[PDB]
Amino acid sequence: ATPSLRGRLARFGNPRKPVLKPNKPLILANRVGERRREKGEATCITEMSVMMACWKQNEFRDDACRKEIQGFLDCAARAQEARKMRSIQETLGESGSLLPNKLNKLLQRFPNKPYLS
Amino acid sequence: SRYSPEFKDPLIDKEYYRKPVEELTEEEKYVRELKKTQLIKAAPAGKTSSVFEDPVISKFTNMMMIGGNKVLARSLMIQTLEAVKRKQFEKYHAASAEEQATIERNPYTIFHQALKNCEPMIGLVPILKGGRFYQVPVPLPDRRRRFLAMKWMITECRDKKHQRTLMPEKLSHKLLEAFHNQGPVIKRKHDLHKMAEANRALAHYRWW
Amino acid sequence: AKHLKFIARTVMVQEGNVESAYRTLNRILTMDGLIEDIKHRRYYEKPCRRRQRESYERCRRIYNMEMARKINFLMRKNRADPWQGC
Amino acid sequence: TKFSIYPPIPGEESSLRWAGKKFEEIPIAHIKASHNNTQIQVVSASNEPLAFASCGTEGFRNAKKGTGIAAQTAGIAAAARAKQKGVIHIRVVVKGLGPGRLSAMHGLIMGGLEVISITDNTPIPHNGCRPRKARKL
Amino acid sequence: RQFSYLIENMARDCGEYAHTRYFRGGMLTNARLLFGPTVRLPDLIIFLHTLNNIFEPHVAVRDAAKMNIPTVGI
Amino acid sequence: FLVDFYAPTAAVESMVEHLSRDIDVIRGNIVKHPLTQELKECEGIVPVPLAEKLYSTKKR
RNA sequence: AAACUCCAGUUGACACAAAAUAGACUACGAAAGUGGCUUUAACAUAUCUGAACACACAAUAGCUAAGACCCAAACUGGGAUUAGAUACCCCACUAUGCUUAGCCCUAAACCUCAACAGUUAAAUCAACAAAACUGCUCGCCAGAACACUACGAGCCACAGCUUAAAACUCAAA
Numbered sequence: 014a015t016p017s018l019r020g021r022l023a024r025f026g027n028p029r030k031p032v033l034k035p036n037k038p039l040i041l042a043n044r045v046g047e048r049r050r051e052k053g054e055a056t057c058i059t060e061m062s063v064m065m066a067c068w069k070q071n072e073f074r075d076d077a078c079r080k081e082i083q084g085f086l087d088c089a090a091r092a093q094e095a096r097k098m099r100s101i102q103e104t105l106g107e108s109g110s111l112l113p114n115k116l117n118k119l120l121q122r123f124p125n126k127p128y129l130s
Numbered sequence: 131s132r133y134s135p136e137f138k139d140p141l142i143d144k145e146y147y148r149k150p151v152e153e154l155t156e157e158e159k160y161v162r163e164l165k166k167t168q169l170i171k172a173a174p175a176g177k178t179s180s181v182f183e184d185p186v187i188s189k190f191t192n193m194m195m196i197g198g199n200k201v202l203a204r205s206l207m208i209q210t211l212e213a214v215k216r217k218q219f220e221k222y223h224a225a226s227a228e229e230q231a232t233i234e235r236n237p238y239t240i241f242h243q244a245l246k247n248c249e250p251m252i253g254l255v256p257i258l259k260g261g262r263f264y265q266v267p268v269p270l271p272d273r274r275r276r277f278l279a280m281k282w283m284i285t286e287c288r289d290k291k292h293q294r295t296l297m298p299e300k301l302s303h304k305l306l307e308a309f310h311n312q313g314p315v316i317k318r319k320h321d322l323h324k325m326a327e328a329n330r331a332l333a334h335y336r337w338w
Numbered sequence: 339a340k341h342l343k344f345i346a347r348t349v350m351v352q353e354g355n356v357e358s359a360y361r362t363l364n365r366i367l368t369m370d371g372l373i374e375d376i377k378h379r380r381y382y383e384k385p386c387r388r389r390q391r392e393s394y395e396r397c398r399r400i401y402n403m404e405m406a407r408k409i410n411f412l413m414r415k416n417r418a419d420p421w422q423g424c
Numbered sequence: 425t426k427f428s429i430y431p432p433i434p435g436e437e438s439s440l441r442w443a444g445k446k447f448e449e450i451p452i453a454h455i456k457a458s459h460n461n462t463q464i465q466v467v468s469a470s471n472e473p474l475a476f477a478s479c480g481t482e483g484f485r486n487a488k489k490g491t492g493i494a495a496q497t498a499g500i501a502a503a504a505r506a507k508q509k510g511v512i513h514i515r516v517v518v519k520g521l522g523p524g525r526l527s528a529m530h531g532l533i534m535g536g537l538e539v540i541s542i543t544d545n546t547p548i549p550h551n552g553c554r555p556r557k558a559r560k561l
Numbered sequence: 562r563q564f565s566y567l568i569e570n571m572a573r574d575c576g577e578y579a580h581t582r583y584f585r586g587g588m589l590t591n592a593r594l595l596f597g598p599t600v601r602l603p604d605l606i607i608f609l610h611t612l613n614n615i616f617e618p619h620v621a622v623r624d625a626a627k628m629n630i631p632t633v634g635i
Numbered sequence: 636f637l638v639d640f641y642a643p644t645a646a647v648e649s650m651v652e653h654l655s656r657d658i659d660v661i662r663g664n665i666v667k668h669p670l671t672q673e674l675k676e677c678e679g680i681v682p683v684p685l686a687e688k689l690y691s692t693k694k695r
Numbered sequence: 696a697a698a699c700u701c702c703a704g705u706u707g708a709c710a711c712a713a714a715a716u717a718g719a720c721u722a723c724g725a726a727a728g729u730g731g732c733u734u735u736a737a738c739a740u741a742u743c744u745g746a747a748c749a750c751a752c753a754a755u756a757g758c759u760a761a762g763a764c765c766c767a768a769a770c771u772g773g774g775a776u777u778a779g780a781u782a783c784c785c786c787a788c789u790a791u792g793c794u795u796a797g798c799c800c801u802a803a804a805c806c807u808c809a810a811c812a813g814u815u816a817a818a819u820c821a822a823c824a825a826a827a828c829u830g831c832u833c834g835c836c837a838g839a840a841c842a843c844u845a846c847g848a849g850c851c852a853c854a855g856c857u858u859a860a861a862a863c864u865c866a867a868a
């Protein structure tokens with residue numbers, strides 16, 4: 014249930030002091046905002062911390078820390094593919110909510126009319 | 131470019147075409163039919179269908195060449211392979227009965243392994259966070275670390291510390307030092323590994 | 339202080355999955371409002387500034403609720419064109 | 425039976441045991457995630473100090489103490505002094521929204537300690553004292 | 562659009578003209594340029610649907626009054 | 636323990652000072668009995684329609 | 696960086712300070728203003744209007760006097776930045792904020808939209824903002840600046856408040 018707007022704005026019929034002081038008129042627009050960019054999550058950090066911890070003990074030798082390096086390597090390969098798959102698939106793939114570009118073509122077919130005609 | 135986008139790169143592999151039709155998968159079969167229609171670029175001079183062709187030794191020759199003098203870079207490359215070969219034969223006749231089984235005399239196996247012992251695993255890439263550039267450790271791609279291995283070997287030999295030593299004798303000495311995990315080129319990888327482990331606090335700035 | 343310990347804001351760990359407990363705990367504190375309250379209590383927010391923020395947050399809710407109510411009302415009309423060609 | 429996220433009340437008898445110990449007996453790991461530091465102190469159920477570690481005690485200075493790597497290092501250092509005294513299972517009571525709030529919890533797991541619960545005891549007043557004035561930076 | 566096909570057929574059947582498509586600005590108030598100087602505009606416009614697809618009056622309702630064309634409308 | 640009783644208005648302030656000196660009384664509060672406050676009957680929740688005519692019908 | 700190092704953390708005892716959530720509520724009161732709990736007293740008026748000064752009120756800051764003191768904090772001191780930095784950033788501390796008793800009487804005290812009654816038709820309305828009007832009454836205003844000034848008067852106000860001009864000047868504001 015959307016909050017009420019009776020006796021909220023400063024008007025002539027409203028005797029009481031205003032409850033809301035909006036800088037922009039409370040009128041729905043005919044478009045939505047564009048989705049922001051996500052910061053992202055660094056990958057292969059746990060594999061990358063145990064591989065740099067083995068070098069210190071083994072004085073940065075790649076012959077005794079081979080197992081750790083594979084974990085850090087194999088992970089990087091998996092993360093690389095995921096980044097490629099996610100970028101294309103999300104836009105092309107239709108799951109859940111629509112995209113702003115596709116939702117603004119639907120809001121322009123049923124525009125909000127704050128005027129009389 | 132004088133080639134259009136339609137033109138496709140050629141496939142020099144000689145055992146690919148010979149493949150029996152019975153092995154061809156449905157997807158592969160389609161591809162083979164598709165190529166017929168496509169236009170094919172002319173094969174460049176560098177790569178043939180020979181059995182001695184090594185793509186890693188051809189790229190290393192191109193990274194040494196100066197001013198398009200490919201006859202000299204290739205000459206240096208072959209002299210180096212012969213120098214690595216003759217030094218190991220000299221270490222094999224003078225070796226003990228049980229030491230001759232662990233002495234590699236094939237210069238190619240030494241070249242490929244020497245370059246693989248110099249490939250770094252992680253590097254430093256500047257990422258912009260809070261209006262500042264931070265050299266955060268990033269997992270280098272396979273190609274990048276393969277390129278650095280070659281660049282470091284060629285820079286070390288070019289470096290004017292060897293007063294009067296010819297490239298074949300210098301490169302052969304460095305290739306044998308990296309084969310046994312020794313020398314400056316290996317040290318240069320450790321120095322990059324010691325700087326990526328000191329700046330591990332900034333390993334979350336990156337997103338991918 | 340005077341209340342019993344290990345009851346409030348306490349979440350138990352299932353099968354050594356601490357990450358899920360911390361994500362669950364952090365979701366309980368955000369839904370209740372403690373997270374933002376702790377962030378606004380680091381520096382004193384003057385009454386006039388706090389009254390200016392409460393209005394902005396209430397006007398954004400109103401707008402976002404109605405904007406969402408129209409998106410769910412018009413999503414039925416996101417189907418294929420039935421009069422393709424006219 | 426099922427699994428509840430609510431802590432087992434002491435009075436009512438339950439069957440949840442860890443190494444034969446009740447929830448009340450388990451030692452407590454008090455984490456204070458500040459903005460520029462992260463102090464960790466492990467105590468028993470009878471309020472007996474077992475281990476103390478912090479970013480400052482691990483050789484970090486100034487702005488290196490307010491990181492997630494320093495908090496994890498202090499957790500490993502507090503999980504090594506308490507593991508010599510017979511500590512395996514702990515009850516975490518985190519206090520503060522600092523950077524080393526979750527990183528210190530990971531360091532305790534990288535020291536051989538098993539976390540059975542996560543308690544939040546961040547000081548929230550029901551208006552009490554007035555904070556410092558907002559800053560222009 | 563649902564009845565666009567039906568209306569166009571009837572017009573042809575009764576020897577009359579139809580415009581069930583997007584109304585380009587100037588069909589009536591600028592016909593001389595669009596069609597020619599000796600063009601003859603309609604003497605009667607029959608509106609089966611007076612509103613457009615965004616639930617607003619059709620532009621021809623106002624443009625037919627400027628050109629003193631009598632309109633019939635549902 | 637609950638003690639329902641009738642008293643004059645002046646006895647509350649005198650009795651609140653007696654409960655503060657008794658050593659066996661942890662906490663004691665005197666409140667107006669909730670049974671002397673009739674509850675007005677409710678017909679149900681009245682729906683509220685969105686506010687209208689808040690802005691002029693002009694083409695901004 | 697300075698500062699502190701009888702410092703920090705856990706536990707326990709412990710306020711003349713300030714009052715999370717609820718509050719997506721929209722209430723009380725003349726306004727100012729009021730959002731922890733309880734109790735007592737208690738919220739003018741059966742026509743409207745009606746005052747810079749009468750009468751009674753009026754945020755914050757501030758004065759006088761006596762108390763309290765967690766935190767905050769003008770001034771001041773220290774540290775740093777900077778060409779400089781009487782600033783912005785850091786630390787510390789005071790007046791002050793609290794209580795009691797008096798004073799002061801200001802505000803972008805602005806929902807910049809007087810009180811009462813009424814209408815939604817007609818010419819809808821310069822623009823913007825918060826649609827346009829009617830009746831009645833009180834108050835106020837007539838180019839800009841000089842001017843929240845000067846003088847006079849009054850006031851527990853003595854670097855103060857209220858009321859409030861003119862001359863020179865411009866052809867715009």
Ligand SMILES: CN[C@@H]1[C@H](O[C@H]2[C@H](O[C@H]3[C@H](O)[C@@H](O)[C@H](NC(=N)N)[C@@H](O)[C@@H]3NC(=N)N)O[C@@H](C)[C@]2(O)C=O)O[C@@H](CO)[C@H](O)[C@H]1O
Nearest residue numbers: 837838839840841842844860861862863864865866867868
């Ligand atoms: C339409 N006239 C505009 C007006 O010009 C005015 C302008 O008048 C200026 C007065 O001389 C000067 O003493 C006066 N100076 C003062 N210290 N009072 C100026 O303020 C004044 N300008 C003004 N009011 N905008 O200069 C005068 C010579 C002018 O041309 C008279 O007509 O103002 C000028 C800008 O100052 C504009 O450029 C003109 O277009």
Ligand SMILES: [K+]
Nearest residue numbers: 803805806807
């Ligand atoms: K205002």
Ligand SMILES: [Mg+2]
Nearest residue numbers: 034035036037
């Ligand atoms: Mg505005």
Ligand SMILES: [Mg+2]
Nearest residue numbers: 550551714731
């Ligand atoms: Mg409260």
Ligand SMILES: [Mg+2]
Nearest residue numbers: 743744745810
């Ligand atoms: Mg009156």
Ligand SMILES: [Mg+2]
Nearest residue numbers: 746747748834
């Ligand atoms: Mg008068």
Ligand SMILES: [Mg+2]
Nearest residue numbers: 747800801857
């Ligand atoms: Mg006045």
Ligand SMILES: [Mg+2]
Nearest residue numbers: 753754799800
């Ligand atoms: Mg006052």
Ligand SMILES: [Mg+2]
Nearest residue numbers: 756757791792
């Ligand atoms: Mg005072």
Ligand SMILES: [Mg+2]
Nearest residue numbers: 766767768788
């Ligand atoms: Mg202080």
Ligand SMILES: [Mg+2]
Nearest residue numbers: 772773774781
């Ligand atoms: Mg200074």
Ligand SMILES: [Mg+2]
Nearest residue numbers: 764789790791
């Ligand atoms: Mg003081």
Ligand SMILES: [Mg+2]
Nearest residue numbers: 727754804805
């Ligand atoms: Mg006000």
Ligand SMILES: [Mg+2]
Nearest residue numbers: 809810833834
């Ligand atoms: Mg009046």
Ligand SMILES: [Mg+2]
Nearest residue numbers: 837838839840
């Ligand atoms: Mg004037």
Ligand SMILES: [Mg+2]
Nearest residue numbers: 801802843856
């Ligand atoms: Mg003034």
